[PDB]
Design a protein around this ligand. Structure first.
Ligand SMILES: C[C@H](C(=O)N1CCC[C@H](C(N)=O)C1)c1cccs1
Ligand SMILES: [Zn+2]
Length: 139
């Protein structure tokens, strides 16, 4: 569970999107595990516009924030699940750290703002769906 609220937008994991999210759809990318829906209320999360590779993420399965070094967004293979078949997920960043099913949605932040949200995990690794390239979220 977890979303980013910037302007009139809500950024969630596509596999966790609700009926309301789909009925108020703006953009969705299955390959990125991302969905953006429209909100009535105005959001105040600052999206980072950078090439930072160090940050801090929220881990609900531990109730702790964790500093991580993370990779640059890229096509990483992700194993089959009840939401998607085996495939390469684009714009994915990996870090050594704890992630469990229930942790998707946790925000990764650097000094510049929100970088992305927890999207994958397992094997002592955590994967983040990057949002920095989505410049339309600001306007
Ligand atoms: C094993 C599972 C995972 O990697 N999944 C399932 C949920 C959907 C993920 C995806 N991005 O396709 C893959 C997770 C462990 C920790 C957080 S999610
Ligand atoms: Zn940054």
């Amino acid at each position: 569970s977890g979303a980013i609220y910037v302007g009139n937008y809500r950024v969630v994991n596509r596999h966790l999107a609700t009926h309301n999210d789909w009925a108020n759809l703006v953009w969705e990318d299955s390959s990125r595990d991302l969905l953006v829906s429209s909100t009535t209320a105005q959001g105040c999360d600052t999206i980072a516009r950078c090439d930072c590779q160090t940050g801090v993420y929220y881990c609900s399965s531990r109730r702790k924030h964790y500093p991580v070094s993370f990779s640059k967004p890229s096509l990483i293979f992700v194993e089959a699940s009840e939401y998607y078949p085996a495939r390469y997920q684009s714009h994915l960043m990996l870090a050594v750290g704890h992630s469990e099913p229930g942790d998707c949605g946790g925000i990764l932040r650097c000094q510049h703002g929100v970088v992305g949200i927890v999207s994958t995990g397992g094997n002592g690794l955590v994967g983040f769906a990057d949002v920095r390239d989505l410049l339309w979220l600001d306007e």
